[PDB]
Amino acid sequence: YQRFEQAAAFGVIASNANCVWIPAPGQLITSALEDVNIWDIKTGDLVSKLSDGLPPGASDARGAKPAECTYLEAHKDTDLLAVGYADGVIKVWDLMSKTVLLNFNGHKAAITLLQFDGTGTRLISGSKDSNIIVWDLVGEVGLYKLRSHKDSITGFWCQGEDWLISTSKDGMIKLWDLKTHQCIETHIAHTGECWGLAVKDDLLITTGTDSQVKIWKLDIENDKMGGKLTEMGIFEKQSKQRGLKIEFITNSSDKTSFFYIQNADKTIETFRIRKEEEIARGLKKREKRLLTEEEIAKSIYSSFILHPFQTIRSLYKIKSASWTTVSSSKLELVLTTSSNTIEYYSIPYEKRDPTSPAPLKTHTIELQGQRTDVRSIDISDDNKLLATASNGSLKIWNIKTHKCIRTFECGYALTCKFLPGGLLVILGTRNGELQLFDLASSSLLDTIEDAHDAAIWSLDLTSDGKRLVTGSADKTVKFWDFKVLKLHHDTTLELTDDILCVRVSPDDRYLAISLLDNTVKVFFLDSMKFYLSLYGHKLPVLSIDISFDSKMIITSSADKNIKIWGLDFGDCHKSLFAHQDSIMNVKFLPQSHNFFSCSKDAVVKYWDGEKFECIQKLYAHQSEVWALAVATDGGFVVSSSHDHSIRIWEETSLKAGERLMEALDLGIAEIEGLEAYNRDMKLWQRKKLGEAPIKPQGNAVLIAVNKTPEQYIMDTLLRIRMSQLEDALMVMPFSYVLKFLKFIDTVMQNKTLLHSHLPLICKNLFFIIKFNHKELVSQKNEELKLQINRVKTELRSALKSTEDDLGFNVQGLKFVKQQWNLRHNYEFVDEYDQQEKESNSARKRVFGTVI
Amino acid sequence: YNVGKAEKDGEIRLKNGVAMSKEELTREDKNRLRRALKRKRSK
Amino acid sequence: DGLIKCLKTLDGHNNRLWALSTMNDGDMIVSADADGVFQFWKDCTEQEIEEEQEKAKLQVEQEQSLQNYMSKGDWTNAFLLAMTLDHPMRLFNVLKRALGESRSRQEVIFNEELDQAISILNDEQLILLMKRCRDWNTNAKTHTIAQRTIRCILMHHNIAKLSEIPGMVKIVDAIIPYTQRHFTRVDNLVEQSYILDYALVEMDKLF
């Protein structure tokens, strides 16, 4: 089939991830959806959009919402970028040739931070599952995986190859030594979460849930157990919301240092850290009024060691930030906000005065976005695109360039539409107001306040475009004509329930109006005569769409099922259920019964109305697709979703016994080679030291699993089961009985694994010599005789060593019981009453007998 | 005497005899004992 | 009685109650009366969770010290951390490891500081240690650790105190008969260990 496939997306200037900044003021990498977009902040154009070579909407696009870009970090001087996506996967790219260089899945949920350290070859990744993984960049492996946290990694910081310290979305902040990969010391940071971490080499700073920013003194070279990291004092901010990123810089040119704490509620709180001169000079300023309560107030430290600064506020909700600084008078802080805007600020400072009661932004990249959710998308004939936003940002795009070339201010507006000549747009707002605009001239043509008593919901022209209809939330739908370029209120059709969507037929024939009482009434346009009343949808019901020849319609609602109706009689054809949250909108192709359905669960779907299959299930959005609009001709569809993204779709084994035998020959070969080598080395040290035997190399499996041959034979003898141990011991021949005796004679010198496996050793050895006893006693060698004698004496020494304390504890515990009894049991001299007491106080147990 | 379940709430005592505490059980071991508990629930 | 808003009943009275006075500063001490008996309720949740979070801070520091000890060695302070925390798996592992290394190296059965630390302990820790000994003894694989700990308790404690703790006969009736079974079994292993002695006398007769 001439199938459908994504052209490109746009709108997303800065989406949900951090921002990394690149010097030349400078460039700036940020995150669009599923791919990163790199700007300069000076001119502001999108000079790069680093993406994959494969788009969603292709043939091999797997059945999944694609992995959203959720963290970025850049290594500058090697020109690399570790970017990481919402499903744990990490791709490391370059910014020059724009190719994916490394693939690093590892995790189970999205990642929260990256960090390059020793700057090359080592990348540490902390995620929303509680792992944190160290990866090498030159070997393409995970080196180690630190695993002790509980909720989700919120910050970490490492130095080289020995010391890391992290903190997570539980209360805890932990310290790892990278030599052993173990958590050394834990501390409950805050009473809830722990949302920030930063450290300049002397002091550490964390922040939790509400403004109690905690100062720590870390002593990395401490030798105590607890004392590696102490808590020194807390201070307060102006924002009660969760501070969640702290960052430090040491500006040069004298030496100085600053840290900011970005919050949630539109506020970054910048702070200055001072010098030892003003510390030691401000000591007596709190030791005034002249001493232990004075020294207690002198430690009660935070406002003493730290200094507030300019509290930079903003218009929209703040997402992420970073900075640059020269001369200590250009603390220049770049900041991506939530409701997408990139903002480059700059706070000046003459070491004492910030020179401004509120700081000043140098740049603000916001022209290619919408600050809100696009409620209505439209198309011109083949060139223009029309987006209507909640703040007021009516905006116009072009197809060939994806650049916003025309932008207005309307209000809380939800449904807009063109005029059939092009370059002219009518819109309806959520307040009772309609509005007319154009493309060539200035912003506003005209405005009709109080066009409706309540919210407009939908509006629709004719094909010649001289008249539109507006159905609104005042239980009323009105007809509006275009006279001369002004609006004409000629008739107002009253209804009983809240009309919410209107659609005309593309041959000016019918007018389908969808009401709040689950139905869609198809009227005739030519007389307003109430042709049909299509019914049975069981929820308030969204956009209707007439077919091209005006014989079929689709009707959608939030009951997840769109219903096809033939219009000759108003008869339902299919009632097909898709889209597991809610269908927002539906659009027929202009010359076929092939159509599209975009839903509240972030998916668009391509159907035909002849077989009622789903021809395609397209998977490029991350949130509620609020509107879609197909081409007026040609088959390419623009879709506008809640993620502030607007995108274009164009056409296309052994067993036991022999495992014991092979482990016996391996272990005894290694043991005998070692004993021969130590014999020859002893003969060199007890003879003329001209030479010696060289060395046995350590055996392959033994040094690979790091086990002595005694523990090797012991744990394979353990892993054979008690069911097949007797057959395992009978299968082996007498050479293996002799080297089994050599194993027993080796193992009862290492008295940790003699005494931890005494009854297994006893069972196996006694069965082995009981079975081979006819051959064993007819062997004639004094070496085996001495081996049996030594095995005998050491074994029975161990067994009498354990039966010693078994007997001692039996007599001791029953003496304890006996003296407790003769202390205070009761006192019957009559034998019968004594035995009645013992019968009434003996232990009972109930046993299910069979009669 | 035979070793039943715990006399505590955070403790998991087996007929083996080996008793564990739910504070020291790591999460993979917690899922492991929960699935084994589910098997002995179904039987 | 009195209730707060559908939760948190209070201790109550025996009869009807027309009395509530919460009219202190924010809401300090609150009064409530029956016919005759009064009730004075204290405060807001400002210290009866502050105690909870400071004992949680002590618990997360001493659990971390137990992990570091169970890593690096020093079985004795790891042992008393396990006893104070009631971490029985770690307690069994530390007693097994200390016993095994005392088997390897060279009256004294664990290392000297560990079994002095078992000598110094109180009646509550001793009764929970003997509960753990009681149900480690029910195996035959992990009974040696239990028997050694019973031996150090017996030969480091006062027998009259050991008897007169309330609860220490309903444990020693649970670990006399398992120990009698084990003494029979290990005695039988000693008895059937004479096939080596028989094979020696046959190999001596051989010529």
Short mmCIF file of C-alpha atoms in Angstrom, two decimals, chain A residues 364-742:
data_model
loop_
_atom_site.label_atom_id
_atom_site.label_comp_id
_atom_site.label_asym_id
_atom_site.label_seq_id
_atom_site.Cartn_x
_atom_site.Cartn_y
_atom_site.Cartn_z
CA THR A 364 14.73 34.16 25.20
CA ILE A 365 14.18 31.52 22.51
CA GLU A 366 10.44 30.95 22.34
CA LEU A 367 9.25 31.75 18.81
CA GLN A 368 8.98 28.17 17.54
CA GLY A 369 6.70 26.81 20.26
CA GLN A 370 3.35 27.32 21.96
CA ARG A 371 3.83 27.59 25.81
CA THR A 372 0.77 25.32 26.18
CA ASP A 373 -1.25 22.56 24.58
CA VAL A 374 -2.34 22.99 20.97
CA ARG A 375 -6.11 22.62 21.00
CA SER A 376 -6.73 23.04 17.26
CA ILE A 377 -4.57 22.34 14.22
CA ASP A 378 -5.61 23.22 10.68
CA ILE A 379 -4.11 23.16 7.21
CA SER A 380 -4.20 25.47 4.22
CA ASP A 381 -4.30 23.98 0.73
CA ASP A 382 -0.72 22.73 0.65
CA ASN A 383 1.42 25.31 2.47
CA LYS A 384 0.24 26.70 5.78
CA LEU A 385 -0.41 25.16 9.17
CA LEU A 386 -2.50 26.68 11.92
CA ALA A 387 -2.03 26.06 15.66
CA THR A 388 -4.25 27.45 18.41
CA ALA A 389 -2.92 27.58 21.97
CA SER A 390 -4.40 28.08 25.44
CA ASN A 391 -2.42 31.17 26.39
CA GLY A 392 -3.36 32.93 23.17
CA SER A 393 -0.58 31.89 20.85
CA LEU A 394 -2.29 31.49 17.53
CA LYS A 395 0.61 30.59 15.30
CA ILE A 396 1.17 29.78 11.65
CA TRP A 397 3.67 27.34 10.19
CA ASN A 398 4.86 26.52 6.68
CA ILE A 399 5.20 23.01 5.34
CA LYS A 400 8.49 23.35 3.46
CA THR A 401 10.36 25.05 6.29
CA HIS A 402 8.67 24.18 9.66
CA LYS A 403 9.25 27.80 10.72
CA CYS A 404 6.65 29.87 12.52
CA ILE A 405 6.15 32.94 10.35
CA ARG A 406 3.01 34.51 11.79
CA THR A 407 1.85 34.76 15.39
CA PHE A 408 -1.09 36.40 17.15
CA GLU A 409 -2.60 36.69 20.63
CA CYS A 410 -6.16 35.42 21.00
CA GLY A 411 -6.89 34.01 24.46
CA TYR A 412 -8.07 30.70 25.84
CA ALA A 413 -9.02 29.41 22.42
CA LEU A 414 -9.84 25.87 21.41
CA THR A 415 -11.33 25.60 17.91
CA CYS A 416 -10.17 27.56 14.90
CA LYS A 417 -10.49 27.11 11.15
CA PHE A 418 -9.41 28.87 7.96
CA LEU A 419 -11.35 30.67 5.25
CA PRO A 420 -11.47 28.90 1.86
CA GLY A 421 -9.44 31.53 0.08
CA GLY A 422 -6.51 30.93 2.39
CA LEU A 423 -4.54 33.56 4.32
CA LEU A 424 -7.54 34.17 6.62
CA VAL A 425 -8.56 32.47 9.89
CA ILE A 426 -11.65 32.41 12.15
CA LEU A 427 -11.29 31.22 15.76
CA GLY A 428 -13.49 30.63 18.78
CA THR A 429 -12.39 31.02 22.37
CA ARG A 430 -13.33 29.27 25.57
CA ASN A 431 -14.81 32.55 26.70
CA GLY A 432 -17.77 33.78 24.67
CA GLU A 433 -15.76 35.38 21.87
CA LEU A 434 -15.03 34.77 18.19
CA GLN A 435 -12.08 36.29 16.35
CA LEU A 436 -10.94 36.91 12.77
CA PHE A 437 -7.31 37.18 11.60
CA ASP A 438 -5.29 36.88 8.39
CA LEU A 439 -1.77 35.97 7.20
CA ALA A 440 -0.42 38.92 5.19
CA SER A 441 -1.47 42.07 7.08
CA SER A 442 -1.37 42.91 10.81
CA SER A 443 -2.81 40.80 13.64
CA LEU A 444 -6.48 41.53 14.17
CA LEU A 445 -9.36 41.96 11.75
CA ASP A 446 -12.32 41.83 14.16
CA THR A 447 -13.63 40.31 17.39
CA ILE A 448 -17.13 39.37 18.54
CA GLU A 449 -17.40 39.31 22.31
CA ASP A 450 -20.61 37.68 23.65
CA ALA A 451 -21.14 35.52 20.59
CA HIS A 452 -22.23 32.88 23.10
CA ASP A 453 -23.41 32.82 26.70
CA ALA A 454 -20.95 30.01 27.51
CA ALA A 455 -17.93 28.36 25.92
CA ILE A 456 -17.64 27.98 22.17
CA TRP A 457 -16.77 24.44 21.33
CA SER A 458 -16.77 23.91 17.59
CA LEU A 459 -17.10 25.87 14.36
CA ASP A 460 -17.17 24.90 10.71
CA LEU A 461 -17.45 26.69 7.38
CA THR A 462 -19.08 25.64 4.17
CA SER A 463 -17.06 24.65 1.11
CA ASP A 464 -17.50 28.06 -0.53
CA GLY A 465 -16.89 29.37 2.97
CA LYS A 466 -19.45 32.18 3.03
CA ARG A 467 -21.07 30.84 6.22
CA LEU A 468 -19.93 28.97 9.32
CA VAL A 469 -21.70 27.33 12.25
CA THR A 470 -20.70 27.60 15.92
CA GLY A 471 -21.93 25.05 18.46
CA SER A 472 -21.30 26.17 21.99
CA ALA A 473 -21.69 25.23 25.64
CA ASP A 474 -24.70 27.51 26.16
CA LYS A 475 -26.97 24.72 24.78
CA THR A 476 -27.08 26.75 21.58
CA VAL A 477 -25.68 26.65 18.08
CA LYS A 478 -25.64 29.73 15.90
CA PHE A 479 -25.07 30.48 12.23
CA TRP A 480 -22.68 33.16 11.08
CA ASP A 481 -22.36 34.67 7.64
CA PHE A 482 -19.51 36.60 6.03
CA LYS A 483 -20.67 39.94 4.64
CA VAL A 484 -18.57 42.91 3.55
CA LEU A 485 -15.08 41.21 5.80
CA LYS A 486 -17.41 41.19 8.81
CA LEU A 487 -19.54 38.67 10.68
CA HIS A 488 -23.31 38.34 10.43
CA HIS A 489 -25.53 36.83 13.14
CA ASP A 490 -28.63 35.69 11.33
CA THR A 491 -30.06 32.76 13.31
CA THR A 492 -29.61 31.06 16.66
CA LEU A 493 -30.79 27.46 16.98
CA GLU A 494 -31.72 26.70 20.58
CA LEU A 495 -31.14 23.21 21.97
CA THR A 496 -31.97 21.50 25.26
CA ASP A 497 -28.55 20.09 26.08
CA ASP A 498 -24.95 21.22 25.71
CA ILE A 499 -24.05 20.97 22.04
CA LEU A 500 -20.30 20.37 21.89
CA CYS A 501 -19.28 19.55 18.33
CA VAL A 502 -20.42 20.59 14.86
CA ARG A 503 -19.55 19.36 11.38
CA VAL A 504 -21.00 20.14 7.95
CA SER A 505 -20.97 17.92 4.94
CA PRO A 506 -18.38 18.82 2.27
CA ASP A 507 -21.20 19.11 -0.30
CA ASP A 508 -23.09 21.59 1.94
CA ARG A 509 -25.80 18.95 2.42
CA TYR A 510 -26.04 17.88 6.06
CA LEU A 511 -25.04 19.41 9.40
CA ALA A 512 -24.11 16.85 12.06
CA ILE A 513 -24.19 18.31 15.58
CA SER A 514 -23.00 16.26 18.57
CA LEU A 515 -24.66 16.98 21.90
CA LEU A 516 -23.88 16.28 25.55
CA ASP A 517 -26.69 13.71 25.75
CA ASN A 518 -24.65 11.09 23.83
CA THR A 519 -26.35 11.67 20.44
CA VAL A 520 -25.48 13.35 17.19
CA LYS A 521 -28.35 15.04 15.40
CA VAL A 522 -27.94 15.21 11.63
CA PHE A 523 -29.90 18.20 10.36
CA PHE A 524 -30.34 19.30 6.78
CA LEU A 525 -28.47 22.50 6.08
CA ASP A 526 -31.02 23.70 3.55
CA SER A 527 -34.04 23.82 5.85
CA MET A 528 -32.87 22.86 9.40
CA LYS A 529 -35.28 19.97 9.29
CA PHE A 530 -33.77 17.32 11.67
CA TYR A 531 -33.05 14.44 9.33
CA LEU A 532 -31.61 11.88 11.78
CA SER A 533 -30.72 11.47 15.45
CA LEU A 534 -27.89 8.94 15.70
CA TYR A 535 -27.87 7.32 19.07
CA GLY A 536 -26.25 4.70 21.23
CA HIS A 537 -22.81 6.01 22.05
CA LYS A 538 -23.08 6.01 25.89
CA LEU A 539 -20.75 8.97 26.59
CA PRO A 540 -20.52 12.63 25.55
CA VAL A 541 -19.35 12.49 22.03
CA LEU A 542 -16.51 14.26 20.20
CA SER A 543 -15.77 15.11 16.55
CA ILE A 544 -18.03 13.84 13.77
CA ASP A 545 -16.64 13.56 10.28
CA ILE A 546 -18.63 13.35 7.06
CA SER A 547 -17.26 11.33 4.19
CA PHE A 548 -16.40 12.99 0.90
CA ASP A 549 -19.47 11.86 -1.04
CA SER A 550 -21.66 12.50 2.05
CA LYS A 551 -22.88 8.94 2.51
CA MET A 552 -20.87 7.78 5.54
CA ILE A 553 -19.86 9.37 8.84
CA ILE A 554 -17.72 8.46 11.80
CA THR A 555 -18.55 9.50 15.32
CA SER A 556 -16.05 9.38 18.19
CA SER A 557 -16.33 9.68 21.95
CA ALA A 558 -14.49 8.95 25.16
CA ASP A 559 -15.96 5.44 25.24
CA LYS A 560 -12.98 4.34 23.12
CA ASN A 561 -15.17 3.21 20.22
CA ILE A 562 -15.86 5.04 16.99
CA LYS A 563 -19.11 4.24 15.22
CA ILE A 564 -19.62 4.26 11.48
CA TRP A 565 -23.02 5.40 10.21
CA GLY A 566 -24.48 5.24 6.74
CA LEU A 567 -26.56 8.34 6.09
CA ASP A 568 -29.22 7.06 3.71
CA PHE A 569 -31.13 5.78 6.72
CA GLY A 570 -28.88 6.56 9.66
CA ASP A 571 -27.79 2.96 10.16
CA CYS A 572 -24.77 1.89 12.15
CA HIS A 573 -22.21 -0.26 10.34
CA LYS A 574 -19.32 -0.83 12.73
CA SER A 575 -18.87 0.14 16.36
CA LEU A 576 -15.21 -0.52 16.55
CA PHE A 577 -13.33 -0.21 19.83
CA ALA A 578 -9.78 1.11 19.81
CA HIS A 579 -7.71 3.54 21.74
CA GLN A 580 -7.78 2.51 25.39
CA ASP A 581 -8.33 5.99 26.89
CA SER A 582 -10.41 8.25 24.56
CA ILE A 583 -10.56 9.21 20.88
CA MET A 584 -10.04 12.93 20.55
CA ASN A 585 -10.53 13.52 16.84
CA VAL A 586 -11.18 11.76 13.53
CA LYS A 587 -10.46 12.87 9.95
CA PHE A 588 -11.47 11.35 6.63
CA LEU A 589 -9.10 11.46 3.70
CA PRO A 590 -10.59 13.81 1.08
CA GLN A 591 -11.30 11.28 -1.68
CA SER A 592 -11.44 7.89 0.08
CA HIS A 593 -13.08 6.08 2.97
CA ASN A 594 -9.61 5.78 4.48
CA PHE A 595 -9.39 7.82 7.64
CA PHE A 596 -7.45 8.69 10.76
CA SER A 597 -8.22 8.63 14.47
CA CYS A 598 -6.08 10.36 17.06
CA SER A 599 -6.73 9.58 20.65
CA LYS A 600 -6.07 10.62 24.26
CA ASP A 601 -3.63 7.70 24.67
CA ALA A 602 -1.01 9.28 22.41
CA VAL A 603 -1.53 7.22 19.27
CA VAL A 604 -2.93 7.88 15.83
CA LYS A 605 -4.47 5.10 13.77
CA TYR A 606 -5.12 4.65 10.05
CA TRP A 607 -8.23 2.76 8.92
CA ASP A 608 -10.36 2.03 5.90
CA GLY A 609 -14.14 2.08 6.03
CA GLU A 610 -14.59 -0.76 3.58
CA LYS A 611 -13.03 -3.56 5.61
CA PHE A 612 -12.88 -1.65 8.94
CA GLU A 613 -9.40 -2.87 9.74
CA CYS A 614 -6.66 -0.77 11.29
CA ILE A 615 -4.28 -0.21 8.40
CA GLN A 616 -1.65 1.37 10.61
CA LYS A 617 -0.96 2.17 14.27
CA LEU A 618 1.39 5.16 14.42
CA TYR A 619 3.60 5.68 17.43
CA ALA A 620 5.43 9.00 17.60
CA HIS A 621 3.75 10.97 20.36
CA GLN A 622 4.25 10.99 24.13
CA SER A 623 0.93 12.41 25.33
CA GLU A 624 -2.67 13.22 24.37
CA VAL A 625 -3.02 13.95 20.68
CA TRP A 626 -5.43 16.84 20.99
CA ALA A 627 -6.05 17.41 17.29
CA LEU A 628 -5.18 16.19 13.84
CA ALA A 629 -5.90 17.66 10.43
CA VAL A 630 -5.42 15.91 7.11
CA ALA A 631 -4.57 17.67 3.88
CA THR A 632 -7.39 19.21 1.90
CA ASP A 633 -5.98 17.09 -0.95
CA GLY A 634 -3.00 14.82 -1.39
CA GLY A 635 -2.88 12.80 1.79
CA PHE A 636 -0.51 14.29 4.32
CA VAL A 637 -1.67 14.90 7.86
CA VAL A 638 -0.47 17.29 10.58
CA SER A 639 -0.97 16.12 14.14
CA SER A 640 -0.77 18.27 17.28
CA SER A 641 -0.34 16.59 20.63
CA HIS A 642 -0.07 17.63 24.27
CA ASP A 643 3.73 17.19 24.30
CA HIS A 644 3.97 20.56 22.42
CA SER A 645 5.00 18.46 19.41
CA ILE A 646 3.45 18.89 15.99
CA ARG A 647 4.43 16.44 13.29
CA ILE A 648 3.77 15.67 9.64
CA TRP A 649 2.82 12.33 8.06
CA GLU A 650 3.44 11.88 4.33
CA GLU A 651 3.00 8.88 2.05
CA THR A 652 5.65 6.16 1.65
CA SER A 653 26.11 -32.53 29.96
CA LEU A 654 27.64 -35.17 32.21
CA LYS A 655 26.05 -36.63 35.31
CA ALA A 656 27.05 -37.34 38.87
CA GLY A 657 29.82 -39.80 39.28
CA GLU A 658 31.62 -38.65 36.18
CA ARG A 659 31.44 -35.02 37.26
CA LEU A 660 32.99 -36.19 40.51
CA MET A 661 35.57 -38.22 38.58
CA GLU A 662 36.65 -35.32 36.39
CA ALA A 663 36.73 -32.96 39.36
CA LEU A 664 38.81 -35.52 41.24
CA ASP A 665 41.37 -35.85 38.48
CA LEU A 666 41.58 -32.07 38.08
CA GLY A 667 41.95 -31.38 41.81
CA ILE A 668 44.34 -34.21 42.57
CA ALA A 669 46.50 -33.38 39.53
CA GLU A 670 46.79 -29.81 40.79
CA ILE A 671 47.48 -30.94 44.37
CA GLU A 672 50.16 -33.46 43.41
CA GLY A 673 51.89 -30.99 41.11
CA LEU A 674 51.99 -28.45 43.94
CA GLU A 675 53.38 -31.01 46.38
CA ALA A 676 56.07 -32.10 43.90
CA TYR A 677 57.04 -28.47 43.27
CA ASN A 678 57.25 -27.67 46.98
CA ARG A 679 59.27 -30.86 47.48
CA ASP A 680 61.76 -29.79 44.80
CA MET A 681 61.95 -26.21 46.09
CA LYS A 682 62.61 -27.63 49.56
CA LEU A 683 65.33 -29.82 48.11
CA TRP A 684 66.88 -26.73 46.53
CA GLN A 685 66.73 -24.87 49.87
CA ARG A 686 68.20 -27.98 51.56
CA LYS A 687 70.77 -28.74 48.84
CA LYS A 688 73.26 -26.84 46.66
CA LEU A 689 71.17 -23.86 45.52
CA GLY A 690 72.15 -23.92 41.87
CA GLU A 691 68.57 -24.11 40.63
CA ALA A 692 65.09 -25.32 41.55
CA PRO A 693 61.93 -26.51 39.78
CA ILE A 694 60.19 -23.60 38.19
CA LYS A 695 56.47 -23.36 39.02
CA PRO A 696 53.17 -25.06 38.38
CA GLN A 697 50.84 -22.58 36.72
CA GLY A 698 47.53 -22.27 38.51
CA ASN A 699 44.85 -24.31 36.83
CA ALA A 700 42.35 -22.70 34.50
CA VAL A 701 39.01 -23.38 36.16
CA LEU A 702 40.51 -23.04 39.64
CA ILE A 703 41.95 -19.57 39.21
CA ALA A 704 38.92 -18.56 37.14
CA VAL A 705 36.42 -19.45 39.88
CA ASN A 706 38.93 -18.55 42.65
CA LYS A 707 38.71 -21.78 44.61
CA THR A 708 41.21 -24.10 46.20
CA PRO A 709 41.07 -27.67 44.85
CA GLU A 710 39.79 -28.90 48.21
CA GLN A 711 36.80 -26.58 48.01
CA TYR A 712 36.41 -27.55 44.36
CA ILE A 713 36.11 -31.27 45.11
CA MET A 714 34.03 -30.43 48.16
CA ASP A 715 31.43 -28.33 46.42
CA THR A 716 31.03 -30.73 43.50
CA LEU A 717 30.58 -33.53 46.04
CA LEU A 718 27.99 -31.29 47.67
CA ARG A 719 26.16 -30.66 44.42
CA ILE A 720 25.60 -34.35 43.74
CA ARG A 721 22.35 -35.31 45.46
CA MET A 722 21.65 -37.86 48.16
CA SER A 723 19.48 -39.78 45.69
CA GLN A 724 22.35 -40.47 43.27
CA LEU A 725 25.32 -40.26 45.62
CA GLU A 726 25.52 -44.04 46.03
CA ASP A 727 25.62 -44.57 42.29
CA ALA A 728 28.13 -41.76 41.91
CA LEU A 729 30.46 -43.42 44.40
CA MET A 730 30.13 -46.85 42.80
CA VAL A 731 30.80 -45.72 39.22
CA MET A 732 34.36 -44.56 39.88
CA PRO A 733 37.19 -47.12 39.59
CA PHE A 734 39.90 -47.81 42.09
CA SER A 735 42.32 -45.20 40.76
CA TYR A 736 39.65 -42.67 41.59
CA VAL A 737 39.12 -44.31 44.97
CA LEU A 738 42.83 -43.78 45.62
CA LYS A 739 42.74 -40.15 44.62
CA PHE A 740 39.54 -39.71 46.63
CA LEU A 741 41.51 -40.89 49.64
CA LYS A 742 44.13 -38.34 48.63
#
